[PDB]
Amino acid sequence: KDRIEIFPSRMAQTIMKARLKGAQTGRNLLKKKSDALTLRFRQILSFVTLDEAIKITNRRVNAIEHVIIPRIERTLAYIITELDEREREEFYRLKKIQEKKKIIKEKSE
Amino acid sequence: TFGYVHGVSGPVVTACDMAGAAMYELVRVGHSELVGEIIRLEGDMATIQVYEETSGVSVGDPVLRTGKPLSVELGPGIMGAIFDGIQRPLSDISSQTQSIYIPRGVNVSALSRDIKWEFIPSKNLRVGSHITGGDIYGIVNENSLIKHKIMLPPRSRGSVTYIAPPGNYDASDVVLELEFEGVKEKLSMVQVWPVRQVRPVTEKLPANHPLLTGQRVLDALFPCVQGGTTAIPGAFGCGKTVISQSLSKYSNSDVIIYVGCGERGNEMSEVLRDFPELTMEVDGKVESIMKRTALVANTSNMPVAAREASIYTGITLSEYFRDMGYHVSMMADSTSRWAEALREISGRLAEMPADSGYPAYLGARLASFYERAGRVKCLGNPEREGSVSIVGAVSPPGGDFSDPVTSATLGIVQVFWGLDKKLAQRKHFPSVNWLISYSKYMRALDEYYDKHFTEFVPLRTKAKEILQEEEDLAEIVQLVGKASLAETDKITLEVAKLIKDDFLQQNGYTPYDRFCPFYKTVGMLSNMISFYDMARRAVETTAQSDNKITWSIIREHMGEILYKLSSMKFKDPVKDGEAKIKADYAQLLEDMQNAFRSLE
Amino acid sequence: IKVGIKMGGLTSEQYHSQVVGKIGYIARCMQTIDPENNLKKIREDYQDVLIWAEKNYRFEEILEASKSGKCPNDLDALSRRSLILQELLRLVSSISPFKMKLDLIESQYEKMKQHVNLWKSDYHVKLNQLNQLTDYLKNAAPTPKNNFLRAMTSVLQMQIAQYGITEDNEGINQLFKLGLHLLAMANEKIDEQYHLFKGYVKDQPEESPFEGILPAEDQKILVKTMIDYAMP
Amino acid sequence: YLSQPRLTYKTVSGVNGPLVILDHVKFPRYAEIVHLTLPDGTKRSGQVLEVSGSKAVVQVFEGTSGIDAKKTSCEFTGDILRTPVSEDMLGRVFNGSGKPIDRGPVVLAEDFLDIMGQPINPQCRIYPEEMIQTGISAIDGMNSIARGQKIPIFSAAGLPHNEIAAQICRQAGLVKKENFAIVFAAMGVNMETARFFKSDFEENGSMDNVCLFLNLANDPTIERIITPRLALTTAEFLAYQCEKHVLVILTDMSSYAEALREVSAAREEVPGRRGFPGYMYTDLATIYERAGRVEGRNGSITQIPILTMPNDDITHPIPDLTGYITEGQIYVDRQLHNRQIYPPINVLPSLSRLMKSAIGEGMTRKDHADVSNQLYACYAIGKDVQAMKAVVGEEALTSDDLLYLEFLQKFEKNFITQGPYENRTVYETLDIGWQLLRIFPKEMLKRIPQSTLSEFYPR
Amino acid sequence: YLSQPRLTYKTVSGVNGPLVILDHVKFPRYAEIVHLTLPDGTKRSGQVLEVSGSKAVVQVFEGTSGIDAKKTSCEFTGDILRTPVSEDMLGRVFNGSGKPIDRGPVVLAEDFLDIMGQPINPQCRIYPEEMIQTGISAIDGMNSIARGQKIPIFSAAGLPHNEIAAQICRQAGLVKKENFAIVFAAMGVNMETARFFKSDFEENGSMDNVCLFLNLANDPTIERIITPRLALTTAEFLAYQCEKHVLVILTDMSSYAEALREVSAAREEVPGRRGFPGYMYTDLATIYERAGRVEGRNGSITQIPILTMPNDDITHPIPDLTGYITEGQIYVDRQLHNRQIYPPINVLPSLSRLMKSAIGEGMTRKDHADVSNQLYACYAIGKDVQAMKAVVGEEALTSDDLLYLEFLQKFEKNFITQGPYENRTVYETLDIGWQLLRIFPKEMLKRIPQSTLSEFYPR
Amino acid sequence: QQKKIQMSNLMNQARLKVLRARDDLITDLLNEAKQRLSKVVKDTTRYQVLLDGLVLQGLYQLLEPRMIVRCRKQDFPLVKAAVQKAIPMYKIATKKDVDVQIDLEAYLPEDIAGGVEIYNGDRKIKVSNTLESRLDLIAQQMMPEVRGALFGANANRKFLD
């Protein structure tokens, strides 16, 4: 739906970045296919097959741009945020550990 | 018999000169005698969790050590009353202080000692009789709905030496005198039980009977049972409080214990105003709902420590009625607010946190809470049968079902009523996801359903398959644009919409959807599935012929059927009873069958 | 090595406390159902329990007997043996005005005892339906509804006293359905109360279904109620 | 009263961030206020957030810059921050510390109330059953406001949430077909924002019924977490002791949350999300729940805790925890603002948790609830159609889809768009609703029963 | 014989959560046992976690509620928790601490064993070989289990992992060309599950060879730390001294890991990932590795532990560390469960390390290894095709991709789907495997040698 | 527009003006109270008794083993007596021996109406019990009653919660 629903992790972050690059390459390659078909289509203007091929290619390109990538970007941003949240709770615990060690040391003196 | 306050960090107070104090004993902190409970012992110093705001407490204030642990008073006078998080009645405070604010340090009896109760003995006991824990030796008529059984407390036994004759007695008198080994015990109508200890039962039994919910979804597809445990981890606006209130208003339980632990104050007032105006006929007589309900208010802006006492106080009350042979269906509208209290206290305690700042023992508290639910054989010679169900809300931040509380809860509860914020935004209420939800009691109730209905189970299965197929298609249709869909798939997609809009959602603030009797849910589902099968057959038998019945042909031919099917919700079961609804649904079935014969 | 036995689900002391009570409970039920000790077959069937009761035992002495294994200290087996008696007790008490013959009581005992699960059986459902009807009438005004339900309830009690609840006799089956329907029926809806009651009376094969079932004083009120309704 | 002389200390043990730790203090009291003087004569105040033995930890409101260790002089008032309140605070302008900044005198108290307040006994709390007419169709129709309800506006930096709040202050009436005392807490805002509201209140001719509390961006960040309590404490006096209907508006609550987060970090408290304290919810409830009617008294408090959503993230802890406490939200967004739509109120992610009782027969018009629910269905579907059409193209749509695009386009420009001074009645709003619903055939209006369609739809 | 009187202390220093701290103790022994007598007579036990000087930290198994710091009496046993064990423990049910719950007597100490475990010399360890025929095609076909293996079942909450484990227990056996004793450790198990297993063992007549250790979800959470060590200690007695073959089931290592986390936090230890002790790896290794065969014995221990995976992930520290210790897994998924597939086992992320050697000519069938690999690859590809179809549509696939999609659908329906009361043999499972493989032309079955194809494929 | 905004400004300033006048009235009263207290201090037969209380009161608030009493020189003969009569009592009320000295080098400003301040041994803890401090300490708490006593009760207040 809104996210690919992959649990936040450094592994997921790496996968999403590779997945995003793939989606962006597909968008550009299909856009070039559409542009090539559009030029030939306009030059002729076996005609209706070009009109269907352009609409089918543009529909796929539009979905990548409006559905699939936005979803990858939302997933990646979600992962990044959740990873920083996990980093924070580790910092908190370590800070208290350092303070408890200092307190223990003072008591021993 | 006193200690002295050493320091205050908020809800946590440190006290000294308490060498003999034990864990989980009650104390009175300060000159206002604030209620608290000992958490830690460090030499002769005690760490006290205080259930009232600690502002104004000074170092050196006395602390009274009370030997009794946090406990609940159990007896007549509970039903119809509203309690705070530690069982101080709010109607008795407001009637005595004349204030609108709850004072701090209020010492009010949980159950009034002025009421003269109508008491009748069991008429089966005699002096010299041997009585054991859980035995019932009389009944008090609290009201016309609930008969309040006077039980011998657990961990007490002996020979009967005196039994009060029938008459008018209050909660300060002696009803039963029994002796064990020289030692004699005098009992009134009120017993005290530590709130953190589980009341003992003869046997925990499997749950084999539905917990009726006034909802189409949350019943037909994801049943709950008497004695079962469920969670509703809805995001804000998802309508999980409304689901809880609907279950409370319209269910087949005998007693409802509603716990508002961290809930908005306006919600508890809504119950107190609305419930008295509801009806439930008993034996030809109209009676109010409040006589069979009780509720606990510990609102969000009240002391955070009290959130733990509120949760345990509620379930302790639930067990009390369970022991008397009643089916109890308690619901705590928060859970996350309780776990939040545990986090805040753990912080003040400087404890080492676990996942996302929560205490490591979060799972331990939830596990022992939910396991107190269940259908049981009661202790006591009279052989009672009862249950406690728990329907607990959870409030995951952002609606992300990943927090320690939702995660731990899902590992405990057997019914998952997941809500989807994106359905609530569309006012698709109840906002049940129906893709991530599940119920592990389906197999348990299959016997019930076959005994009373039979037709329900194959309808339940077909409905789930249609909804799953729609999701499987929606994923790809978003990308294709409905270009490659077969005629059999277009029917699935449109019937699935029919189910979603007319069956799964209902407006709980209407005279017709406020309660959906089960026979109506299965009745209207049968018609919707019957349409599915007939419409799918119509195309399957014609697709390869010299004229295929595509959706556009059946849609134009049967448009009146599709509208009538959508109107099936608007039946008002209170104005139009069972006879008219069944006859009406039968008419739509006949209309469909006749239209198909003229179509194909 | 006995730090926490938790026998079945209770602390050992609480478990044995429940056993002592159950023994006393059966003794009380037997004395309540059979004051004259006529049910010789059943009293023998509980002899291993009743030997510990109806005698000068102290509570602590029976508790000791449980711990030492000198009495039927199997609480789950003892519970089943108690229930097959508690259900018989309420069967007899719920029909108080009409006593069963001793032969019928023993037959009902065996039919319930031999059931794999009495609690969930049809016997229990029928008893619950009867008690819903007879409990309501314990404290009720002599209203048209209450006089009609009273008359039919006495018939139900009579028929049960004659036949018991093991056989699905059409007489008791129809009375259960009609009694529960009338009881549920709204108190103000008198026209249906008279319609339903009259339909019953002229459906029964008897010329006077209540003859010998209820006293003449109730017959006078019963008939007067119908007379007033049909007066205008 | 407190007759015993207060003690003055020069016993400061040490200073750590915003917290000044004193030793040798006689019987320290928790949550008592301490007044301190710096070596240069500067006066500052703080509150004891912890006591232990002879030690006490004082959080200084103005700040700890320049606090000495040997010459610092502190005195303990002997009580909690109880503040002077009087009826004639209306028409006065105060700072975030409770002091006047309008060149008038200090408050001549009628009483002293505890800034922490008390929770209202839920048994005496009376459920709200009156509607306020905001004049904004986007609200009065689909997300009604009750008197005593808590409805923040969820907004984002740069959006005109200040104009909407100002508009509400002037044209907020009743649907019983009334002068509200407004308490406006301007915290974490610049001069121009505070001057905007102050000027508007005078322009409206209502300044004699407005009490302002200002705590500007250049003011201390610790006072920013008592300003709401000062405003609400005054509101409680007016509403529950003088039976005056009060409207309390709290400016960007996010400056409260940030001020609170700073304190949480300073005291090393257990974080929850995004660094905020794990008790953020409880603290917000202390502020928010000071609202609603009380049985037996003719006053009320209505709150509008407007807040800015960081990065438009609706799941940020601030709007998230608020969403759990308040009775829904109005919620504005950038998608409407970027098209010059005012007010830019997006109904889809919004709700009013009291609407079900404040509308309908005896309140507004019996079809109110039915019109709202169907408009929600049609609006959301139109958005769903755009999500599809963005990929498949207009040629892939059928007549069933174009109707929702026509509805959506007419809905936003006719129903939502109004203008800063367009004051519509609730009855006019519903009539507009029907004008949009009449775009569809009866069979498609599936949220409305035929018992309603047959009466209203034909017109 | 330790004929030395025991010391009992009242010198309690303090109590903090599950931990009781004692002082003035004479020569504290590490991992000793202390019996606690509460002021009201309640008796409880605990084990020493650390000692230092005259102080010791005691882990209280039953719980610390009710313990004071003045009267509680602490009796030191002078030894390590060596538990009584007996060959006649079968046909008994014990609680989480090894005490009777079945109304039977306390187990008579035929001997005592230190539950900490006695490490077995790897030189004398015998490599497992014989295959266990579990009846489940997902296991017997692909991820087969050898006797003496260590193959836990991963699952998330709500999945039927209790049904799969129960099915394996009653269907367990060897591949034939006499049966297992069961040691069942319930850790944090709810009552509904507890009766599920207990009833299944009784209905199938297995109780004669079953020993249950029940620590239920409503029982103490510290006790369950030893529960799994008590269960395996009995298994080791029965398998290595009484020449029995023992199958050990651990209902949840996650509730065990949580119990360790509670203690680790209680003593303020430095955590690792997600708050769990940095030594979780060791605490698991010392339990999981109590398996296998030893030279000179005929018995064996086979472990099949169960682990609930928080958040449905498989990178959580609990399943992550387990995966590094155990020899593969089953991994019960959720996507198969939602589709009404049972057993819902996902073959791709699940492996069995001993499978490559426990199959083949002389143990199962000549082609077993080849069939498994080909089916696995076919399934993996089918999933990649499904991943593409979801984007490009069913009209954008070639003929070969359709063969894998047809395989995928028929594979789950005919091979994985079985039912809980039907067992299939390894030879029947492979025959089904071939039916799925024969969907493809031989040229595409690139992981099966030509000799194998010619023998079986055309049949 | 201009007419109504100008009248708003005028009414707001008139409100502030009368409020300022009201505060002047409160100040005049408090300044008269200071003069009345001075007249009382001039009366030895009541001021010595006041001092007896003021010294003992401060002693109970500090509860220190060593005291330094600071006063203006003019009142030293009476503070000396106030201490002499305060110690026998202090040692009875607290059961603690306290060494109470009077500071003969440091004095309070001559413009203090009267009263004493007491310091602990290290001069880090002090209690201020002079007449000006007491007048404000009480007057600030009694003000709600003065407001009503001088100008009348607020007719719109019905509840005292």
Ligand SMILES: Nc1ncnc2c1ncn2[C@@H]1O[C@H](COP(=O)(O)OP(=O)(O)O)[C@@H](O)[C@H]1O
């Ligand atoms: N089942 C329902 N039927 C009708 N309206 C509902 C239902 N559930 C929620 N609503 C509406 O949506 C609002 C949100 O529900 P509420 O319980 O307040 O949300 P939360 O999930 O935060 O508890 C309700 O006040 C009501 O207006």
